[PDB]
Ligand binder design. Sequence first.
Ligand SMILES: Cc1cc2nc3c(=O)[nH]c(=O)nc-3n(C[C@H](O)[C@H](O)[C@H](O)COP(=O)(O)OP(=O)(O)OC[C@H]3O[C@@H](n4cnc5c(N)ncnc54)[C@H](O)[C@@H]3O)c2cc1C
Length: 464
Amino acid sequence: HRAPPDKIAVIGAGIGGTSAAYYLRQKFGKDVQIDVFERGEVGGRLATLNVEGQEYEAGGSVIHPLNLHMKRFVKELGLSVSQGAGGLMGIYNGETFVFEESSWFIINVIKLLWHYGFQFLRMHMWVEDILDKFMRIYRYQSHDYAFSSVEGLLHALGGDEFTRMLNRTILEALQKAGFSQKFLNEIVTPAMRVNYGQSTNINGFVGAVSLAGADSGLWSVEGGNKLVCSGLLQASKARLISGSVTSIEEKTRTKQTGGTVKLYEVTYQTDSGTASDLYDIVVVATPLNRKMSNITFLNFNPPIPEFHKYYHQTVTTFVHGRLNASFFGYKAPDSFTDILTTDNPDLFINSIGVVSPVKEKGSAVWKVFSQEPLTKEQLNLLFASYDSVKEKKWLAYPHYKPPEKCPPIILHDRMYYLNGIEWAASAMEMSAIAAHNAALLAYHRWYGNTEMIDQEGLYEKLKT
Ligand SMILES: Cc1cc2nc3c(=O)[nH]c(=O)nc-3n(C[C@H](O)[C@H](O)[C@H](O)COP(=O)(O)OP(=O)(O)OC[C@H]3O[C@@H](n4cnc5c(N)ncnc54)[C@H](O)[C@@H]3O)c2cc1C
């Protein structure tokens, strides 16, 4: 038994930050002060963007059914789900379509059998086994077990298989599993491009998450994914502070009872000028690039270990206007919503797809993933006409460079960093798992419940 903490800072009003605030509240009780910093708008990558009067998801867009944190949250917050359908889908290689979906599902079955055989089925079954192991996390989190390291977490779910996938490229992985060069370049690679704007040179684990994201049932939050952030924030009853955190420094206190412990001074800038406050615990729920969150770490002993890592640029470009169906090879096209690309370096886009707005109400609204800002020439070559154009540059996810070691969860004595998780998978639910885990870990670390940390073979014992 020990003194419960007075103040906790959470840096970042992301889905990660606000999820932390929520779970912290659940572990430390109503008493503890929780402050969430946000230099920008709540939601971070779950922003929207106004296009001819309506809001569209510009960052985090869809949510899988096995995203239980987001499911439980939308339920608890009483938000509505925009579980819509989609449309038609094709893969372009820079000459023609290696594959196009038909209106008859049986046609599609036939096409995919001829072109790929059972590889469609076999990937499914390989992915299910990965997912199935991964779902163990919920049971462990519902029983409050924590993990000090993204690797250790994965190990606890899938054992060595999962830690080896992290160090493998999803290409290596699927070749070792006997998937064909054809299927890898025609199916798998486009999926990587659309999802993570990178090729099959990304973490096997990320990649398998990616491939479940072609599973069906998908949905989004009606009104914006970013509502989930503000909704949790409210429901956690944390104090939201608009300011760009600049610096974080250890100090020593003096508990009335002659204490001598280590606090963290967080300095942040606002309109008015500089301001600061002292915290017993810190959770960083933003990436630690100097381009993404300029926090300086002062007088630490020992120094925070190396989270130095780089994210990948993806530009979401929205266009109200009609496509150039002839730029993909149609001439007189009888009658055609999403185009994915193969890894052809003559292409300048990752994907291009008609979108619906967040609210629920040709020449329509399109969404273009590109590595770089689209030039006038490329917009013109892309669309016949366009009334309006909107574009956000998004350090969106890691530049997965396997083999590599995920950034720590523990930066210091009582300072935790959840965005390490991205290097296993960048997704909404992944931020939620990390936040949950980060909260548990901090709690167990504060109260010294070492029986609850880094416990292996949990699933067996927890299994009936
Ligand atoms: C283009 C795109 C598409 C995506 N599509 C999907 C998808 O289809 N499905 C899915 O599940 N996920 C998707 N994601 C991921 C989704 O956005 C998740 O939210 C993501 O894993 C975490 O992003 P975040 O900013 O919400 O969280 P975090 O990165 O954990 O939160 C970062 C927060 O910290 C704040 N911050 C930064 N610096 C400071 C500072 N100095 N002081 C205070 N606050 C600071 C930021 O403003 C932000 O709010 C997508 C992301 C992008 C960019």
